[PDB]
């Protein structure tokens, strides 16, 4: 088993209950290091509509020792929550956030319609409509370079066959469930029990 015990509780509450979440293209990453793991809070809360745990099972079998837990938070539209699965393709998957096909983690997603929709629309959350190439697993593109779509040089300004690579979601308070924001906190585990920097909450060794 061989895990150490750190009295420091892991700040999953910080990640999940944060006031402001990042956009999908500029996906915010936090490293959960050197703390005891809290996973049953997530399991029992049950207000998380999507709790898809690849690799590890979501039925109370994640009391495991991890050397590294990576937490990623972004806000996307409801229709593309399926998009962010291992080995799936779409706009969000190939241009904003790509999940490795061997992902051993938990894609956690819940509604933020009250929090992340503002009257007259909320345009704070962006997404990359077009990009030159498909995005590699765990890569953030913050470039604002005008996408080329024609022989004409973009010259840095937008126009025909030259577009701003990013676009606004535009969540509205009265809108379809398919068109409402879902905060997603992708949890990436490494499942190494020998270093086990991220302590598991079971009795020591």
């Amino acid at each position: 088993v061989r895990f150490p015990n750190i009295a420091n509780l892991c700040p999953f509450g910080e990640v999940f209950n944060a006031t402001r979440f990042a956009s999908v293209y500029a996906w915010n990453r936090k490293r959960i290091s050197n703390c005891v793991a809290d996973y049953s809070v997530l399991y029992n809360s049950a207000s998380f509509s999507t709790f898809k745990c690849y690799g590890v099972s979501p039925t109370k079998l994640n009391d495991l020792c991890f050397t590294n837990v990576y937490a990623d938070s972004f806000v996307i539209r409801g229709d593309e929550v399926r998009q962010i699965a291992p080995g799936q393709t779409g706009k969000i998957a190939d241009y904003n956030y790509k999940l490795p096909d061997d992902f051993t983690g938990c894609v956690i997603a819940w509604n933020s319609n009250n929090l992340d929709s503002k009257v007259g629309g909320n345009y704070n959350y962006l997404y990359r409509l077009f990009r030159k190439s498909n995005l590699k697993p765990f890569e953030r593109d913050i470039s604002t370079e005008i996408y080329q779509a024609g022989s004409t040089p973009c010259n840095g300004v937008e126009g025909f066959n030259c577009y701003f690579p990013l676009q606004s979601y535009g969540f509205q308070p009265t809108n379809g469930v398919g068109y409402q924001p879902y905060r997603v906190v992708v949890l990436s585990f490494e499942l190494l029990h020998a270093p086990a920097t991220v302590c598991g909450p079971k009795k020591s060794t």
Partner: antibody
Amino acid sequence: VQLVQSGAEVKKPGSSVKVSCKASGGTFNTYAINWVRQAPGQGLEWMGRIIPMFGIANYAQKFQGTVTFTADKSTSTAYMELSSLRYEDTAVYYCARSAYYSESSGYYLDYWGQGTLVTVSS
Amino acid sequence: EIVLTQSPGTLSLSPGERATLSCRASQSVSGSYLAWYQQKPGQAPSLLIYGASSRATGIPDRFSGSGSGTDFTLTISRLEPEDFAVYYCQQYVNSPRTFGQGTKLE
């Protein structure tokens, strides 16, 4: 919806000036700001655009190196800096908002400010 | 660069009814990405039309643009007393958003 800017600059030749176009709430969010030089008794010249959210300002070949576009995300105000007053630089500087987003595909100036005229004097 | 040449240089002579305001470009305007701006004297130009014929908000539909490729038309059904300003052409088709010279400048 309203983009009230500066008035008139008593700038002696060679002395720099900064413009102060004021964006209303939500203008900066989804709209870029464009500057249009209107030299007295000529046509409209497109100096360039500033995308406030990502702080991107691109200028035309003519005005490159002679003018600087800045915008303040807090207070929602657009600024344009003239390097110095060259003799031909006297003009009515305008400010207008264009959609920069791919879906809208408008890239045209919807609303305009009153105008800021620079000159040797008043 | 896409340049523009407005042909009817001076139409502020109180003309009657239809006016065939034109604008042509060296390379054809692509995607009908042209707009028309009305510069009332002493004031800043207000958008009058955009696209090939897409009328602006708060502008009477009598002002139309019958443009193919480069938008070379702007038709006002009646020349009302208020509408005697300087109408401008602008293209946003991958250039430094070059304008025209103006069409009804006294």
